[PDB]
Paper text:
The non-receptor protein tyrosine phosphatase [name], encoded by the [name] proto-oncogene, is required for normal development and functions downstream of growth factor, cytokine, and adhesion receptors. [name] contains two tandem SH2 domains (N-SH2 and C-SH2), a catalytic protein tyrosine phosphatase (PTP) domain, and a C-terminal tail that has at least two phosphorylation sites. Normally, the binding of tyrosine-phosphorylated ligands to the [name] tandem SH2 domains is required to overcome autoinhibition, but oncogenic mutations of [name] destabilize the autoinhibited conformation and lead to enhanced basal activity in the absence of tyrosine-phosphorylated ligand stimulation. Allosteric modulators that stabilize the closed form of [name] have been recently reported. This class of allosteric inhibitors was designed to stabilize the autoinhibited state of the enzyme by acting as a molecular glue between the N-SH2 domain and the catalytic domain.
Numbering used by the authors: 4 to 34, 40 to 84, 95 to 154, 160 to 235, 245 to 295, 300 to 312, 325 to 525
Write the structure that this text describes.
């Protein structure tokens, strides 16, 4: 994941490839994203677009993450051979750039644990760097240790030994080969210092700091961590399952996927169980998946569905109508759905459905369909009010039903908009019950969700929207 450079211009990108690279060499960067590839001694740039639903390469295919886009094309003309590595530490969890000695010690004391480390721009020595580690309150059993990093001729060192190309090289080297103190203190770089974990009550202050862009820096630092969540999706690739996918490359992880037990390969659905109240993050239905969608709802005993998109957007199908018309009755394979009544609110439409297995009478249960419909075609809503009110209603309908299964959430690919609502709900559920006095970490919760379904929360727009949604809920609490 060293191939992504987040702070360079197309001119800098052209030099790098033509001078410090060869034919086949590549790199990605924001300009939307740009894929700069080297072909026959020349740089060829490519557009990568993200609407908030998926990653789109012009002429290429639709992907859940930037890492899988690069991975798919490093085996499948424009050739992707040698990634050109970035030496910039901006997108690194441990880097805190312009930071003071006491400001660093303050954070390592307040939030630090054993092996909690961070790198900063040297206060005293000009142009150099500082590695601060906490090995282990007021008992003196734990201590802060300052290791000077000398910057000389575009290379980094800790006063001796090897000279590294980037701070990233140095950090990853002393993480594997820890520095031993003169009296034997092992300077373990166990994990970087947590800074994103903030109290629920101090959200207005944190947003104010992130608005200074702070949200962009924090968002790409989380995108850097996506290569750590590249878990197997073997089932989605199986011949008989390729048609059951909206997008052949946006597949559910094998470990979290929903396995259909109803009964060749009738067990597949492009869906995942999200366990932080549980959820099912799925895509919009296809003609050949409608019956499977109802087989899932039945099996997992789901009583609430959250539709985050319209049936048709910008002239194309975002989710096929899988529910019968008002007052009508329909059979979807072995399932029978009755649209009891539709009630329209301003931001949504609620559909009271009655799902049951064909042949069995007591198998009937009410499935409340919440269809959100004021989400813009491109981007995120201006105000989080409508979304929050919707989710508040969804929670209380879910809470009212005894032994209810997971809340089914779905948009187009079921990763972007689906992920935004699920993350907003998980965070809002904490503040609801565990009050305003609890710790809220937005990128940790996203990463936890992303471990369960690829690409959950697609854009910086949605990332910021999650903070603005959380802030509002507290401000009105
Ligand atoms: C200036 C800086 N280098 C960029 C922003 N920044 C951070 C830090 N940590 C996360 C984080 C937190 C929990 C889980 C995961 Cl996976 C991640 Cl990545 C984050 N998103 N941004 C602070 C340092």
């Amino acid at each position: 994941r060293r191939w992504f450079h987040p702070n360079i211009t197309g001119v800098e990108a052209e030099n790098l490839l033509l001078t410090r690279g060869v034919d086949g060499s590549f790199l990605a960067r924001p300009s939307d994203f740009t894929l700069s590839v080297r072909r026959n001694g020349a740089v060829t740039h490519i557009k990568i677009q993200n609407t908030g639903d998926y990653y789109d390469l012009y002429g290429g295919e639709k992907f859940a993450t930037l890492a899988k886009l690069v991975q798919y094309y490093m085996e499948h003309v424009i050739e992707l051979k040698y990634p050109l590595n970035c030496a910039d530490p901006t997108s690194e969890r441990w880097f805190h750039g312009h930071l003071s000695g006491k400001e660093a010690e303050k954070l390592l004391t307040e939030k630090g644990k054993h092996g909690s480390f961070l790198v900063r721009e040297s206060q005293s020595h000009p142009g150099d760097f500082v590695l601060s580690v906490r090995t282990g309150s007021n008992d003196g059993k734990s201590k802060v240790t300052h290791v000077m990093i000398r910057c000389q001729e575009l290379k980094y060192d800790v006063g001796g030994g090897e000279r590294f190309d980037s701070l990233t090289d140095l950090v990853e080297h002393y993480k594997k080969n820890p520095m031993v103190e003169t009296l034997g203190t092992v300077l373990q770089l166990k994990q970087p210092l947590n800074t994103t974990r903030i109290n629920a009550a101090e959200i207005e202050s944190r947003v104010r700091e992130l608005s200074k862009q702070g949200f962009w820096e924090e968002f790409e630092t989380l995108q850097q961590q996506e290569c750590k969540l590249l878990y197997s999706r073997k089932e989605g690739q199986r011949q008989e399952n390729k048609n059951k996918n909206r997008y052949k490359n946006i597949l559910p992880f094998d470990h979290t996927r929903v396995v259909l037990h109803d009964g060749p390969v009738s067990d597949y659905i492009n869906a995942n169980i999200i366990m932080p109240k549980s959820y099912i993050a799925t895509q919009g239905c296809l003609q050949n998946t409608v019956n499977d969608f109802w087989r899932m709802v039945f099996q997992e005993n789901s009583r609430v569905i959250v539709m985050t998109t319209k049936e048709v957007e910008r002239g194309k199908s975002k989710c096929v109508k899988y529910w019968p018309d008002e007052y009508a009755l329909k059979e979807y394979g072995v399932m029978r759905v009755r649209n009891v009544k539709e009630s329209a609110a301003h931001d949504y439409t609620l559909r009271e459905l009655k799902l049951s297995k064909v042949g069995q009478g007591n198998t009937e249960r009410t499935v409340w369909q919440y269809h959100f419909r004021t989400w813009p075609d491109h981007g995120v809503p201006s105000d989080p009010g409508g979304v929050l009110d919707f989710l508040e209603e969804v929670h209380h309908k879910q809470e009212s039903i005894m032994d209810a299964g997971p809340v089914v959430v779905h948009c187009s690919a079921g990763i972007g908009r689906t992920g935004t609502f699920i993350v907003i709900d998980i965070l809002i559920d904490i503040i609801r019950e565990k009050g305003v006095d609890c710790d809220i970490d937005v990128p940790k919760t996203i990463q936890m969700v992303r471990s369960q379904r690829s690409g959950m929360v697609q854009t910086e727009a949605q990332y910021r929207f999650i903070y603005m949604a959380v802030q509002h809920y507290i401000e009105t609490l």
